[PDB]
Amino acid sequence: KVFGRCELAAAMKRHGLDNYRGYSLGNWVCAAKFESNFNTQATNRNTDGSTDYGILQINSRWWCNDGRTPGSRNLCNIPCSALLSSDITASVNCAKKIVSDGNGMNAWVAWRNRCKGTDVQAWIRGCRL
Ligand SMILES: [Cl-]
Ligand SMILES: [Cl-]
Ligand SMILES: [Cl-]
């Protein structure tokens, strides 16, 4: 499923991500835009042998299990494939853990490089919400 922008904003808000760990909704929408282009099915292999999964590109070395990643910790206790679902619940639950791990949203490279410090409220402009 490829979410619309306002559609994803509404889902993220309903799931309690708006202002979670102090990160406004636009931060989360921007992160998803550049991590997955709002595509729940997105997967991308990383250089260390891990893979990033889903709308928020959650990593298989630390956070989810994909069965093929050396050093995997599965801290979200979830199969990575469950993070590719059309329902974002599992990705949100795991993202809440990631953003609580000490470095905030810096855990998302695309957020750090493309969202951090920018006018992130623009990502929710026009939405009823
Ligand atoms: Cl915002
Ligand atoms: Cl959803
Ligand atoms: Cl923080």
Swiss-Prot record:
Chief localisation class: secreted
Domain C-type lysozyme: 1-129
Classification via SMART domains: LYZ1
Reactions it catalyzes: Hydrolysis of (1->4)-beta-linkages between N-acetylmuramic acid and N-acetyl-D-glucosamine residues in a peptidoglycan and between N-acetyl-D-glucosamine residues in chitodextrins
Keywords on record: Allergen, Antimicrobial, Bacteriolytic enzyme, Disulfide bond, Glycosidase, Hydrolase, Secreted, Signal
Tissue-level expression: In the egg white and polymorphonuclear leukocytes.
GO biological process: cell wall macromolecule catabolic process; defense response to bacterium; defense response to Gram-negative bacterium; defense response to Gram-positive bacterium; killing of cells of another organism
Name of the molecule in the record: Lysozyme C
Organism: Gallus gallus (Chicken)
